[PDB]
Amino acid sequence: MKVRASVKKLCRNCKIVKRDGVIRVICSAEPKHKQRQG
Amino acid sequence: MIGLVGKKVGMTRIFTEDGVSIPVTVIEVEANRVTQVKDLANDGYRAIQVTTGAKKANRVTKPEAGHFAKAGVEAGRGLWEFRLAEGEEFTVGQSISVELFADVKKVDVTGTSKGKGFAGTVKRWNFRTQDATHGNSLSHRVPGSIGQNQTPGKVFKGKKMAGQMGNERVTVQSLDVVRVDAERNLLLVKGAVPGATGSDLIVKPAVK
Amino acid sequence: LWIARINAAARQNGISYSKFINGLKKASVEIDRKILADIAVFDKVAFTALVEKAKAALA
Amino acid sequence: SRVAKAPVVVPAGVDVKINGQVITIKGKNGELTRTLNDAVEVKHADNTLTFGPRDGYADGWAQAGTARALLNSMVIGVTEGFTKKLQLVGVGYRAAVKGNVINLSLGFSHPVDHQLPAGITAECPTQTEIVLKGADKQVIGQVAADLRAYRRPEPYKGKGVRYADEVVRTKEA
Amino acid sequence: MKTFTAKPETVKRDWYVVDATGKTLGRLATELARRLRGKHKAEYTPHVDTGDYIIVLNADKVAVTGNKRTDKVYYHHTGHIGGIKQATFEEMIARRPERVIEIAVKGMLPKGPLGRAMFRKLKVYAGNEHNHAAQQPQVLDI
RNA sequence: GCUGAAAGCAUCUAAGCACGAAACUUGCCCCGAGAUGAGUUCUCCCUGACCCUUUAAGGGUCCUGAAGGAACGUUGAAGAC
RNA sequence: GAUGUCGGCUCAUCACAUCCUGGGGCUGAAGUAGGUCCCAAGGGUAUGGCUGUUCGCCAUUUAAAGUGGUACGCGAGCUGG
RNA sequence: GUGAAGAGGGAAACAACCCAGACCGCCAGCUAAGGUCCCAAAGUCAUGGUUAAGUGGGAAACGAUGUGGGAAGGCCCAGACAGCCGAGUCGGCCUGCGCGGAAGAU
């Protein structure tokens, strides 16, 4: 997982979610696209 | 479950038929007599009180005599208590003997340790000694520094220093039961236990 | 001390200190806090009468 | 909203009882009870249930949608039921069922046993299949996930416990 | 004449009983402190005690707003180096329910011998049964 | 991770439910009611006459001296005292 | 009209930007071994040759030989190169 | 301008900041700066709105379907957007309050 202060959509299969006060990116095609804001 | 109260007799060895020596401690465990049963409605917890030994009649005060006479037993040299588990019951006046430990493997033993008086840091806390030569000035077995400086400017609570050593309560755990003899009132355990010759011991089944 | 005692006395009759004093001002009474506290402790019927006059003025 | 604005029909032979915020549904396949959030109103007219928001609450419609979905699932479960299928891939991997315990050999040095909860039934047609039958969607899903978690599928060959209709990707070293 | 002053040898006091089910902690504690000190009598005197005795029932059922059931932290220190310790509101309610109201009220009283004496007139119970019926307390709705 | 809407799809979360570490609370050992919020249980001992005054948790005269403790002596694998 | 100072010895205590042991995500991760990031402060974290040396180089060990604050901790505690 | 050579009230404690210049006595009244749930004197005041972070009660470039208000655009029962019939949907601009970035030694 990538811990960054700038979280973006990298391809067309990514989605942005808000879980427990944290913004995350989840991808259903590439495991490398998983991001977490922190 | 419950335990018993005994006296320390000494130490010896047992030889085995295959060529081994086992160092054992000999404990004399006479019969223990129930003096009071404490329950949950009147006291708040479940326990029994027991006595053992003998004591001369001219040294027994009237309150103690009345306490013994209510139960109906003769006087001993003390009173001890043991907490009860769920499903254990005893009755006033009953006697308990060493054969309770017939099928037990390991025990825990509690006693009072030998006294040493005032002791230093080398003996009490294993501090290291400074040099004996090379120019030392009156500081060989002394402790050294005990703090830092203006910050914090005090000595922390719990610092290791000199004082009284020994003469306190000690438990030892998980000792093998080498032998139980009922016709003689003897329990032989393997190893060593705290105290001196002629002291009171408490023996319980192992908790671990 | 006087002000605290007056507040306690008035809240038992059903008003607060600030409103009580405003009502006395609008009714043109000129008794001071020392006398008011003395009366509140030693004579209660008169204090009820004063509270009633203040309430009438405010109404 | 758009989901809560469709009533749920109760097929013949299903009994519904409403008491305050507690709802009970009974039928041929069994019994199911629930307690709803304190923001919804449920009304039963002749053959359908309808859900709506109460007054004074700021999130009535979302709660209504959730409740509608839950009751629809209960209605289907109390009559027809639910099924799950599991598959095993590998060499030396197998499963068996006795009573309410599933014994799995999955390449470990010790046996693995799993004890089913109340209300779920299991069976094995072949040594390398499991079928679960039940009436509660959440519990059936939880049991399936639990069984999966023992030895998850891997990305170099695919060995492990997987779902029936799951696609597992692979890559090369 | 001089201003009136109360005398501890002749002061009246009364017994009250209160229930704390579903009530806000601070908004109950204020009233408790006020009536313990005696700010509700015209005989109020700063250097004398003029308050009442109060019994509190159902202390394991007070209420807090927001996320305070899990996020309010109580701290203390043991006197030994490194001995800082903490607990949460849930843990306090699970172990020692009365300590909660007791701390809340204690923080709201004067500091000194007289405040310590005032604190002694507070009885807090975790259940719904007291054993002080020989004093005949009156029901107080706060 | 399961079920699930706001957002007819999807979603571990907003309503509900399950796992998860030598860190946290316990379980093991030692101290501990001056815990002035000074706690509980069992046993033992004391059952006489009068005066005064400013009248009360008052002062005094004769008879009586329990349970127990302390002091002294011979001492201890207890101890600077 | 005075707050003794470099290294060494004896004795310590705190933070986490974690050296070892514990729990996880990604990998250009087949296995054994690795690379990078997240959580985690309970315990444990070398003996010698040279030099006044802290450092440093060297020889042989260890699961590992952590980086910093405390008057560059500590001379009414020692030494005096 | 103040302190030095100036006391009194407020800012928790705080020469130089805000209010204000002490001849002596009073158990009288009105106000300034600042305040009115308890420590601690005085509104648990009245009306209309916002925040869910204990933000209020520490801090940036940058990132995000958090949530209020305003003015215009494209498509829409000549059946639109998402999925396999029936009421709306899509993308920008201006503005109010919040979230992340955010690690230290008794």
mmCIF file of C-alpha atoms in Angstrom, chain D residues 1-2 20 48 56 67 71 85 100 104 109-111 120 124 129 149 151 159 162 168:
data_model
loop_
_atom_site.group_PDB
_atom_site.id
_atom_site.type_symbol
_atom_site.label_atom_id
_atom_site.label_comp_id
_atom_site.label_asym_id
_atom_site.label_seq_id
_atom_site.Cartn_x
_atom_site.Cartn_y
_atom_site.Cartn_z
ATOM 1 C CA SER D 1 -35.269 6.093 -1.743
ATOM 2 C CA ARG D 2 -35.815 4.638 -5.200
ATOM 3 C CA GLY D 20 -43.226 -1.571 17.957
ATOM 4 C CA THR D 48 -47.515 -5.868 0.988
ATOM 5 C CA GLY D 56 -37.529 14.727 13.153
ATOM 6 C CA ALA D 67 -34.738 -1.919 6.017
ATOM 7 C CA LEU D 71 -37.017 -7.560 4.875
ATOM 8 C CA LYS D 85 -20.685 -23.633 -3.161
ATOM 9 C CA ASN D 100 -22.103 -30.542 12.020
ATOM 10 C CA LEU D 104 -10.366 -30.477 6.039
ATOM 11 C CA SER D 109 0.947 -30.927 9.828
ATOM 12 C CA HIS D 110 -2.184 -31.075 12.005
ATOM 13 C CA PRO D 111 -5.895 -31.769 11.460
ATOM 14 C CA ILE D 120 -26.683 -24.077 8.461
ATOM 15 C CA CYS D 124 -19.927 -32.881 0.039
ATOM 16 C CA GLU D 129 -16.559 -29.829 -3.143
ATOM 17 C CA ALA D 149 -9.680 -18.027 5.180
ATOM 18 C CA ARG D 151 -5.828 -21.515 2.890
ATOM 19 C CA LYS D 159 -4.130 -23.846 -5.026
ATOM 20 C CA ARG D 162 -12.160 -20.856 -3.606
ATOM 21 C CA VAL D 168 -8.532 -16.158 -9.847
#
